[PDB]
Design a protein around this nucleic acid. Structure first.
Lengths: 126, 119, 50, 52, 87
RNA sequence: UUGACCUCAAAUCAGGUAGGAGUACCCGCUGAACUUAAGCAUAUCAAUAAGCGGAGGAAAAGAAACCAACCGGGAUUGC
RNA sequence: AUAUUGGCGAGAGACCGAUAGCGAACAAGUACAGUGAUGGAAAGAUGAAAAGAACUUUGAAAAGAGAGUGAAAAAGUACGU
RNA sequence: CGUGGAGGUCAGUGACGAAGCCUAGACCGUAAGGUCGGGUCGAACGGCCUCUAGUGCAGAUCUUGGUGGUAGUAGCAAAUAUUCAAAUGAGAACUUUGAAGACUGAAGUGGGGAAAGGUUCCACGUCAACAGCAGUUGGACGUGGGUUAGUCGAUCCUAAGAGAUGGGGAAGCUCCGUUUCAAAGGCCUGAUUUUAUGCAGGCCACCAUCGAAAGGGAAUCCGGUUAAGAUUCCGGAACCUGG
RNA sequence: AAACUUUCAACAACGGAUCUCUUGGUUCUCGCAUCGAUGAAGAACGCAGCGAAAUGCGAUACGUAAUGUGAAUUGCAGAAUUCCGUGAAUCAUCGAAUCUUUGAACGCACAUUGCGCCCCUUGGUAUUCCAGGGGGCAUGCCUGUUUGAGCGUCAUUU
């Protein structure tokens, strides 16, 4: 709402924090939700993506398959898949560029990275 | 690899002196193996160690100057900074209003009494 | 000839590295739309004259 | 703009060889094959009615 | 008269490489420059016309110290130090 | 067959000062042409374009040898 | 209070949409030329992912004619149309 | 009437394919035009009632870019001359090697320097553009290597010439002159090795700087090796200056 | 009954409109005052494992240190275990350092990393020359400590 000061109500002048966005916050742009089970157990749905966590593909072209987050792209805004890998010209590994937001997370890894941080990030942990 | 930075600030000027020499021989041994192999095992972790050593040593030699030269208006031109010209000049928090017996009647003796215009 | 100086020759000593543009990797980088550079020069037939 | 077309002021040839009024931009084969600004000629459009 | 050369027998550098800038515009004879003023305190950089001005200004180069400007007084004459607060 | 004050000088020390770029706007000094022209000069363009120096962080100006002939007037600039 | 075309931080907007707008959205006081003060270029566009072309036949290389991949090979390093 | 653009409305249309281009496809109108179909293409579109004026187009020697007829055209004549064989190759009148026949006749296309140029020389590899025919070679392109000095130069000095302080104009930015009223420079010795130097005699008129790669000038030649280049490295034989 | 030329509806070259778009650029309000002898700006000489051309940086030379965020980037290579919290990070933040030859840039110059002196320390078993490292010195005004001419003017002892 245009009322304060720091607010851009223009279309073209709203993509400045995208191409020149800070890499420390570009990762936040590439976040991932949860499910219909961890919602009433954690409270917060939007959680930072992690390499040590797995994910399942719901859309795209691979229904019923799960992938693992490995190398992530920020300049192209994507992420390769460790599990689901296609074949190039001989049969190796094709850099399938996807995104954790369009994928449903099934499993995680309960550490001290959360819980106490959830209290700081607003919540009530497990 | 990657070294630390807190382990160098806990050492004296003599311990860091011998440590610097140990990093000197590390340079000559980490430049030869390059014309053969296209990449060296440890080629990145060599300009981060020595760069941290010289920082600590130089810092400890400047903090000692602020010891005996502390408590005077005549400290060497190296303890302060660049700053600006406005602070070194212009008015002050005392010279702007030289408190005396005459100028006192301007702001001090005769200031501005509070009031409430109503009834 | 060769004989001149250093300060003058120093300012003219940088185009040696201009003889080595794209090997076999710069062609495919990160969002690169500009391949070869249009600043090449060979004074065998080119008349730059500073 | 008070500097749109106000940045070019040269002189071309006249009679003799086949050449029209184009401010001879220095250098042979410099892309500027007889350009400039001025009115509605050289590669640089004009704006009628200067917006006060 | 000439025979043929007008730019023929040319083998003597007139304007030498200016040590001050590098635009090559100075001679030993007249001892004067045509780039940014050489032996003297002068600086050939005026404001006539709608062009030929910004190349002597700022913003198009390095500005190694001007970056220190938009940096310090963003808070209020910060010339001290700081430490930790919340991890 | 002999010591002070004033004026005029000479260093590499503690403590200070000077030489410029950018430069919207504004100020002081000096100084042109073209357009219009019931021919030419006077005049208009024009206390101008361009260029230079200094100060400030707004500048110049302004708390009355000022403005009126009225119901006496109550600092400067700008719309 | 009043002024405020250069520097810094929002909307600076009923503009224009690559021969247009300032000279510059890109390497932009660019490239080229000149002894100097200067004038000042031409070229905006792949797709979700280069998977940027497996293998086989002819050929010295660069290609064409098949096949595979792609929603479409009527997008094939001469780039949407 | 059409195009671009803003506001409002049919709470329109829109991967059942918008808009734009072509159409020897059709209907309506005197003239400005619009709609439909097919093909191509795959992302936001159109009409009416208003507002805005940098909207429409054959010529101003109009501007910029690109493409024809002419045209598979003119030209491809300064400088005597080509041909055969071998190696390589898909491909040779022309590059390499050998032989024969010739041109230029140290006033030459030789062999050494300065200026310009700073990786165009040497080695290896390659033939898609350029190299106006050809060309495996090359001054095209990519990947490397060589740069070693007390001595021949330069730097130092001087003439021509440029240009400060101490004076003399101007509002500012400066120019001319080079010693045109000097308080310009501070040393040998005596009293002082261990005082990093305070007071008196006896002397000297030189007292900003820059300024020649054909001139000026105390010093090194010859031979061999390498893919290239020395008087520089190696080996042998010598001299001068300063401390 | 052919080839070629003009008018030429599809496919297939060279040439590469218009329309639909964007991280940016011309006319104008408000707010803020953060250039300037602890060394500005521009330009030249440069820097990463394949770095030629920008930006940034200046032998700590695409960084170091501190703070915040709290579990990476890339076309490829290299890759230690601090990876469940003495600090990854090509982004961002950045009060304290460093910054050559040039440059408002300083003994004296520049077609020339040109050309000297003094002080401190080490070696050449030499306080004097040479080499290396660190630290300096020039002009025009206005104050001040330690110090010099000139019988212009003005004073005190046998």
């Amino acid at each position: 709402a245009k009322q304060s000061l720091d607010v851009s109500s223009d279309r073209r002048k709203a993509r400045k924090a995208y191409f020149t966005a800070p890499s420390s916050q570009r990762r936040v742009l590439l976040s991932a939700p949860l499910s219909k089970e961890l919602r009433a157990q954690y409270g917060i749905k939007a959680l930072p993506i992690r390499r040590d966590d797995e994910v399942l593909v719901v859309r795209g072209s691979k229904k019923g398959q799960e992938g693992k987050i490995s190398s992530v792209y920020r300049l192209k805004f994507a992420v390769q898949v460790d599990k689901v890998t296609k074949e190039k010209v001989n049969g190796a590994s094709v850099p399938i560029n996807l995104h954790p937001s369009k994928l449903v997370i099934t499993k995680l890894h309960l550490d001290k990275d959360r819980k106490a941080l959830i209290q700081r990030k607003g919540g009530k942990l497990e | 690899a990657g070294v630390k930075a807190y382990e160098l600030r806990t050492k004296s000027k003599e311990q860091l002196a011998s440590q610097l020499v140990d990093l000197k021989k590390e340079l000559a041994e980490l430049k030869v193996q390059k014309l053969s192999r296209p990449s060296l095992p440890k080629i990145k972790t060599v300009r981060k160690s020595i760069a941290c050593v010289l920082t600590v040593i130089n810092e400890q030699q400047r903090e000692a100057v602020r010891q005996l030269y502390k408590g005077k208006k005549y400290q060497p031109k190296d303890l302060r900074a660049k700053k600006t010209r406005a602070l070194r000049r212009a008015l002050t928090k005392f010279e702007a209003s030289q408190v005396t017996e005459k100028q006192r009647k301007k702001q001090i003796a005769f200031p501005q009494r509070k009031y409430a215009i109503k009834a | 000839a060769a004989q001149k100086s250093f300060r003058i020759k120093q300012k003219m000593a940088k185009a040696k590295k201009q003889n080595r543009p794209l090997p076999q990797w710069i062609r495919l980088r990160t969002n690169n739309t500009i391949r070869y550079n249009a600043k090449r020069r060979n004074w065998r037939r080119t008349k730059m004259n500073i | 703009s008070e500097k749109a077309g106000h940045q070019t002021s040269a002189e071309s040839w006249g009679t003799g060889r086949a050449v029209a009024r184009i401010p001879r931009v220095g250098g042979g084969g410099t892309g500027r094959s007889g350009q400039g600004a001025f009115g509605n000629m050289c590669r640089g459009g004009r704006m009628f009615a200067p917006t006060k | 008269g000439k025979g043929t050369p007008s730019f023929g027998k040319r083998h003597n550098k007139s304007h030498t490489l200016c040590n001050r800038c590098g635009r090559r515009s100075f001679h030993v004879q007249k001892k004067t420059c045509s780039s940014c003023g050489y032996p003297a305190a002068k600086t050939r950089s005026y404001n006539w016309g709608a062009k030929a001005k910004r190349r002597h200004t700022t913003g198009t180069g390095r500005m190694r110290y001007l970056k220190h400007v938009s940096r310090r007084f963003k808070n209020g004459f910060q010339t001290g130090s700081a430490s930790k607060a919340s991890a």
